[PDB]
């Protein structure tokens with residue numbers, strides 16, 4: 001019993017974190033096989049950051065302009081290339097701690113673990129979701145760029161995020177490991193702003209299912225809803241639309257608890273209307289949207 | 302910016318987790334140097350769990366009755382003994398991944414990371430506090446026993462918890478690594494219940510300081526208070542008493558933010574008295590008590 005925001009064990013990722021230095025800038029890189037991945041903005045100076053021409057900045061660099069430090073050891077850079085918004089530094093040693101891995105681009109609503117790192121050394125691990133507005137609500141200080149997000153379903157690490165920047169509202173933006181940004185963001189210091197965020201409806205429902213599995217039914221009611229009426233109400237509280245895909249995805253949790261998906265939708269409508277009236281659900285006084293259907297099955301009996 | 306419930310990186314502890322099997326029971330052990338530590342209840346069957354005589358159950362076991370698996374390798378047990386409520390299995394190989402470590406006993410209110418494991422295979426990590434009633438609000442299924450809690454204080458892992466049981470309210474009880482229970486619990490199937498819990502006041506204040514650092518200031522006010530008046534308020538709301546030591550510990554955060562501790566106590570008094578009036582603090586509608594002052598400084602400063 002219990003329900004916690006639970007991260008993956010971080011050791012497989014810790015063994016891959018290095019420090020990348022270019023000029024006066026130091027940040028984190030990810031060392032897999034004989035390649036070090038890091039944000040391309042490492043090559044920017046103070047001037048550059050508003051309108052950097054990365055191709056022009058990079059052509060001016062040699063291999064030995066990049067200092068890569070893995071623990072106490074310097075790695076030798078023997079090649080470099082840029083792919084989208086990541087720098088790939090080819091090094092002369094394959095990382096002996098390279099885990100089985102892959103690169104996956106995730107969708108909004110997906111969760112992952114972040115290993116926050118400074119100077120190539122891990123500081124902490126926490127669980128995040130990709131928000132509907134393509135930001136993450138992380139915890140990051142200066143020097144954290146190049147920290148990564150991952151899942152480890154099985155023994156295979158799926159890298160899905162690399163940290164590039166903090167927006168003015170204090171939320172975070174980054175790329176997949178192919179260097180493509182999530183959302184409309186760019187790696188420039190121009191004024192850009194996250195869109196209005198919404199609540200991840202399918203995850204809230206998943207979490208209501210978790211509460212039922214863990215023995216709590218107080219918030220259920222005798223009613224049902226059509227999918228369309230559910231969406232008409234939920235969007236008035238800035239909830240994401242629920243799609244038939246989402247309904248299908250919740251089918252296993254529906255079967256385990258004996259509560260139909262649109263019946264749970266009816267419960268959610270009433271919760272939005274009434275609030276909790278001094279009660280909690282799995283120890284929360286708010287409706288939690290950073291647990292996916294898959295996370296609930298992973299964690300719950 | 303941002304403030305998350307954050308665990309220590311778990312890699313140093315992952316390299317020490319093994320599977321211990323005795324009869325039909327499989328659970329997790331901690332392999333350090335040439336000893337594997339696990340809950341002594343591993344030697345019990347269901348009937349034994351009712352009224353175990355551990356000494357008597359153990360004398361009947363041979364070394365080879367304990368199957369210890371580190372990944373895909375079986376370790377050979379060459380000795381076994383008990384210390385309080387933990388079994389110590391001496392094995393023929395020192396763990397080459399043994400980190401620098403100590404065994405430390407923590408106090409209620411202190412936080413730590415838990416590496417939850419099943420069949421000696423780490424599955425997740427989360428951050429816990431030791432509650433004033435000596436339980437933890439963990440997340441554990443059958444097979445989780447022997448999962449461990451820890452802090453890292455440099456390159457040194459301080460092991461502070463090993464999981465033994467779930468209580469009827471769905472909270473968790475366990476020992477330090479010397480096998481001494483936290484709380485008035487025993488390792489047997491009998492009627493056991495957590496005492497009524499309280500809120501960890503010094504931690505709530507720490508978290509209010511985190512909120513201010515991150516730009517959430519709506520709850521600050523022009524008032525201050527005294528320790529004695531505030532403590533009358535804490536007691537009324539089932540908060541732990543705040544001591545001078547607590548005030549001293551929060552001194553750095555007071556200096557950084559310009560909010561004295563008793564000034565922040567005046568904020569907290571008003572929150573307890575009036576509620577939050579629809580608003581949140583760091584995304585929470587309740588007052589969070591599982592960050593220590595040290596946790597806030599560690600996360601907010603480096």
Ligand SMILES: CN(C(=O)Cn1nnc2ccccc21)[C@@H](C(N)=O)c1cccc(F)c1
Nearest residue numbers: 041049140141142164165166187188189302
């Ligand atoms: C370098 N930048 C950070 O936000 C870096 N960072 N990340 N998390 C951060 C958290 C706190 C402070 C800084 C943080 C920005 C910036 N505005 O300067 C930037 C400029 C140019 C190209 C970039 F891709 C990013």
Ligand SMILES: CN(C(=O)Cn1nnc2ccccc21)[C@@H](C(N)=O)c1cccc(F)c1
Nearest residue numbers: 001342350441442443465466467488489490
């Ligand atoms: C083995 N026990 C668990 O609670 C084990 N466990 N831990 N977290 C648990 C979470 C879910 C289910 C079981 C869980 C009990 C029991 N009832 O048999 C017990 C027996 C003997 C000595 C003990 F200290 C406790």
Ligand code: NA
Nearest residue numbers: 522524564567
């Ligand atoms: Na005040």
